[PDB]
Design an enzyme around this catalytic site. Structure first.
Site, PDB file in Angstrom:
ATOM      1  CB  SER A  73      -0.931   0.206   1.267  1.00  0.00           C
ATOM      2  OG  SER A  73      -2.179  -0.771   1.144  1.00  0.00           O
ATOM      3  CB  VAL A  93     -15.055   7.339   3.446  1.00  0.00           C
ATOM      4  CG1 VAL A  93     -13.874   7.623   4.305  1.00  0.00           C
ATOM      5  CG2 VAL A  93     -15.025   6.760   2.084  1.00  0.00           C
ATOM      6  CB  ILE A 152      -9.795   5.761   0.692  1.00  0.00           C
ATOM      7  CG1 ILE A 152     -10.033   7.243   1.011  1.00  0.00           C
ATOM      8  CG2 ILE A 152      -9.028   4.970   2.220  1.00  0.00           C
ATOM      9  CD1 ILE A 152     -11.202   7.093   2.201  1.00  0.00           C
ATOM     10  CB  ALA A 157     -14.361   4.153 -10.135  1.00  0.00           C
ATOM     11  CE1 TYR A 196      -7.012   6.265 -12.291  1.00  0.00           C
ATOM     12  CE2 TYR A 196      -7.590   8.732 -12.743  1.00  0.00           C
ATOM     13  CZ  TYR A 196      -7.090   7.609 -11.846  1.00  0.00           C
ATOM     14  OH  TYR A 196      -6.999   8.147 -10.531  1.00  0.00           O
ATOM     15  CE  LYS A 226      -7.433   9.401  -7.094  1.00  0.00           C
ATOM     16  NZ  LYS A 226      -7.018   9.213  -6.003  1.00  0.00           N
ATOM     17  CB  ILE A 285       3.318   1.725  -7.274  1.00  0.00           C
ATOM     18  CG1 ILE A 285       3.609   3.017  -6.714  1.00  0.00           C
ATOM     19  CG2 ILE A 285       4.085   0.610  -6.349  1.00  0.00           C
ATOM     20  CD1 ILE A 285       3.499   3.336  -5.482  1.00  0.00           C
TER      21      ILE A 285
END
Ligand SMILES: [Cl-]
Lengths: 251, 253, 249, 250
Positions: free
Chosen positions: B19, B65, B92, B95, B156, B163, B192
């Site tokens: 993470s 959340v 966090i 989608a 994306y 974002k 990553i």
């Protein structure tokens, strides 16, 4: 134990203890760097020598960036003292006084434009080029810019053109030096307290943090970018300006 | 004399030792911070408790959340342990699968859009607002974003819209909380697992970034530790790229 | 000889003669477009019918963008009149009043956020999607944004988030619809009727004047036309150059 | 009834029927403007007189922007024919060959840098200032830029720095000339059909899956030069089939 332990860093443009350059030198030394300094004209040899002593260093070298011979001689001299260079702080920047006061076109001339671009923009990648043969693979180069490169600020004028070219040189240098492993960044610093009052007061009233940045805050940001903590960061223009760039102030 | 000595930081989104939150937690702990963690669902309580123990902590709290009751309870619970909060890391985002694959319009639905923006964008300022009464005056709030907010990246899709809204909340939050002294920033992290199309992005970034390498959670962690600390006291409202310089080039030509 | 001759264009958001959509309608009609209009609520039918008549049109359709059924009925209805659509103008945008006044956090609730994003951002690509089966291959879609999407403007608050998502939808729409040939753009318009915000813009914009709906309308008509066939995924500022300065100093 | 009817516009950088300046000239003429043209060197006076003739014009003038005297003489000359000037198109831009191929540092020299900034950046506001006494109050100045100003593009090197300076000049000029009413803009144009690779990539990865034509750049230019764009200043408009807005090739 400091985060620049064992890093050798050359700093340009240290003229007084109110310099951004002074703030960065102080932060770097605190975090364990060994420093070297440039100065312009034998008239400033003594002054720069005293600064270098404050930072525990005897390494000072003349370098007027207007002169190709001097740039080349700087790194030939420096290499006699250091096997490699880990950091460079470019903090120089000149325009003729008319070229950054009043109306943009009033102050515009071919020579004013030339000098501004040569000293404030060209000199960064010129130094990088001349340093390349002795740069460590994980070296970090740092220059300073201003929000005037991005949006039109009253009076900044020709300097805004030159700083735009500087920030573009950051990206092109990043590509050119990056396969080797070298990082290249800029800090876009807010004004520092020391008509300019109009700017300082406005920034203090309109910035998200309601305060002007200090040379200590800009110094710490620079030390970070010079260090291995920032190894994922290159080609970046980082704002260190209490957030002023991100608002439409006064409105 | 770690540069976060004495700082108390709450981290969301720690699900594995791969993470982004784990890398940030490691760097913060190394620099002297005390850490607390959130988790989603009682079925992850034991695992987050293990990770917390790894960072010398016993402080874990549920926070889905999507639920106002959990957000409103989080800082009431935290307050029984810590009088004030110095750092918050928001890592966090979600989608629905179809909203981040293929054609942007085929995967678009009102509910997909709603979810993506509720979890990935709204939650950040929502947590900040709930945290406000216990934030130290020099606290620092950090979220994570991606270049897909700025420019269109294949697949994306709906996450790019969310974002963008998240990055905008960074600027609006910085203004709201700044007079008190609180700083708000984002890291726009490079990529990553086995996801084929994501593997193609990783390969492209390794060949075309200025540093010719992908970023690591250690590099993102250190940048995050910096923005969380008083070394970054002049920095707010910033979206800092930690992506080997990839956002700054036109790659592949 | 008008540069929009023959073009069939649907406009949302025309509420009065001061609306941005009214300026775009004027500019589009001047350059030879045929126009259609939406309205929200049976209560507004007669008043939109009257604007439409001013522009030589009888084509008016209900469309509350919160309702999927209305969005899909709009395009079923229009298709009975027009075999294909050449342009769409999205000039709608809403946030509950507390969400766009005062402090950002005071007005922040999950439902205020959801509404603001649903009406001001999601509706643009949703309309694009519903329109797609009847869009001409060289259609042009235009939405309206504000500098508040890019930099934090006082009181703009939750709408700054919604307009950042909207501008992002312009780039993703342009990719999705582009191979067919459809272009997608935004105008980031200066403020248009507060007297203090307008005064700050008049005093600090490069052109030392506020923009008019005639100026935004003309820029809109241009982006809607084949004159702009090379322009997509663009957020064009039409704001007297105010975005490009640091005012107040 | 064109949208540039009556406007008198001066165009630099017209060297061939594939010049961006040629496209902008065609579109402006189409829309009713009266044109004048500059050229560099006696050697090119005939070729430009011809191009000029193609657009109903006999107004051609020498102007090497490396030279202050020539810049001042251009507007002295122009004034004897036109009482006022409504538009300027700046479409010139040079860097030495070495400064725009291969590695950025290999091609970097002080003189390469000086030349690139002098001809491609400084010349725009230099022409603006020399034009100012005859500019009409609603005049429009236009320059041409490229994405390499904003992001690093292979081989673009020193020109990327000069275009960044030029784009900043757009914002400073807009402020300087705006109270009068003059507007100042740039078009950031896509490449027009090593370079083969660039064109291929843009055609594959742009949202519209095609390269831009000089006709598309020309129409955008004519718009910005017109009163249709009277609300637009300090703007760098992309005319590049959406390419700037994507991360291509992944
Ligand atoms: Cl309401």
């Amino acid at each position: 134990m400091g985060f620049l332990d064992g890093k050798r860093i050359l700093l340009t443009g240290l003229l007084s203890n109110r310099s951004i350059a002074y703030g960065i030198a102080k932060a770097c030394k605190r975090e364990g760097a060994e420093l070297a300094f440039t100065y312009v004209g034998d008239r400033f040899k003594d002054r720069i020598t005293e600064f270098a002593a404050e930072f525990g260093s005897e390494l000072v070298f003349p370098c007027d960036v207007a002169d190709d011979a001097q740039i080349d001689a700087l790194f030939a001299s420096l290499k006699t003292h250091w096997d490699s260079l880990d950091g460079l702080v470019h903090s120089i920047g000149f325009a003729p006084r008319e070229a950054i006061a009043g109306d943009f076109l009033d102050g515009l001339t071919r020579e004013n434009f030339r000098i501004a671009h040569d000293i404030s923009a060209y000199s960064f990648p010129a130094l990088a080029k001349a340093a390349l043969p002795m740069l460590s693979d994980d070296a970090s180069l740092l220059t300073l810019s201003y929000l005037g490169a991005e949006r039109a600020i009253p009076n900044y004028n020709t300097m805004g053109l030159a700083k735009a070219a500087l920030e573009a040189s950051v990206r092109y240098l990043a590509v050119s030096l990056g396969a080797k492993g070298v990082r290249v960044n800029a800090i876009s610093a807010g004004p520092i307290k020391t008509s300019f009052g109009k700017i300082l007061d406005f920034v203090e009233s309109n910035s998200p943090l309601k305060r002007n940045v200090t040379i200590e805050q800009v110094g710490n940001a620079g030390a970070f970018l010079l260090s291995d903590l920032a190894s994922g960061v290159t080609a970046e223009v980082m704002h260190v300006d209490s957030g002023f760039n991100a608002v439409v102030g006064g409105m």
